[PDB]
Amino acid sequence: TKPHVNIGTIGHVDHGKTTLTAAITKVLAEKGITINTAHVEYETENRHYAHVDCPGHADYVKNMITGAAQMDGAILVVSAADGPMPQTREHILLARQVGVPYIVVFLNKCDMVDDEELLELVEMEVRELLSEYDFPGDDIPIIRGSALKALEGDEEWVEKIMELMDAVDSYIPEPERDIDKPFLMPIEDVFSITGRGTVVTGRVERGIVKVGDEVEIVGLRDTRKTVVTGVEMFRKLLDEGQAGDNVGVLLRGIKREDVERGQVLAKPGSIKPHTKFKAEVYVLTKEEGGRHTPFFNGYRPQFYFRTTDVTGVITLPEGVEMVMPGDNVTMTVELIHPIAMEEGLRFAIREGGRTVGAGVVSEII
Ligand SMILES: Nc1nc2c(ncn2[C@@H]2O[C@H](COP(=O)(O)OP(=O)(O)O)[C@@H](O)[C@H]2O)c(=O)[nH]1
Ligand SMILES: [Mg+2]
Backbone angles phi, psi at 272, to 5 degrees: -125, 150
Asked if 244 and 323 sit in the same domain, the reply is no
Other C-beta atoms lying within 10 Å of the C-beta of residue 226: 20
Asked if 265 and 281 sit in the same domain, the reply is no
Resolution stated for this PDB structure, in Å:
2.0
Tell me which DSSP letter residue 303 carries: E
| CATH number of residue 160's parent domain | 3.40.50.300
Calpha distance 244→192 (Å, rounded): 24
Asked if 350 and 236 sit in the same domain, the reply is no
| CATH number of residue 325's parent domain | 2.40.30.10
Q: Determined by which method?
A: X-ray
Let me know: does 349 contact 357? Beta carbons within 8 Å: yes
Asked if 49 and 78 sit in the same domain, the reply is yes
Query: Is any atom of ligand 1 closer than 6 Å to the C-beta of 111?
Result: yes
The ligand minimizing its distance to the Cα of 87 is 1
Nearest CA to 196 out of 256, 265, 257 is that of: 256
Calpha distance 191→354 (Å, rounded): 29
Calpha distance 37→26 (Å, rounded): 19
Query: Is any atom of ligand 1 closer than 6 Å to the C-beta of 78?
Result: no
Calpha distance 296→183 (Å, rounded): 38
Calpha distance 208→28 (Å, rounded): 38
For residue 1, the SS3 value is coil
* Burial grade of 209 (CB within 10 A; 0-12, 13-18, 19 or more): buried
Q: Which helix (H) or strand (E) holds 37?
A: none
* Cα 170 to ligand 2 centroid, rounded to whole Å: 26
**Which residue has a Cα nearest atom 18 of ligand 1?**
14
Asked if 114 and 101 sit in the same domain, the reply is yes
* Burial grade of 275 (CB within 10 A; 0-12, 13-18, 19 or more): middle
Q: Which of 152, 175, 198 is the last residue of a domain?
A: 175
Query: Is any atom of ligand 1 closer than 6 Å to the C-beta of 26?
Result: no
Q: Which helix (H) or strand (E) holds 173?
A: none
* Cα 196 to ligand 1 centroid, rounded to whole Å: 65
Domain, as residue range, for 263 = 178-272
Asked if 119 and 207 sit in the same domain, the reply is no
b/e sequence 339-359, b meaning 16+ C-beta within 10 Å = bbbeeebbbbbbeeeebbbbb
b/e sequence 279-308, b meaning 16+ C-beta within 10 Å = bbbbbbbeebebbeeebeeebebbbbbbbb
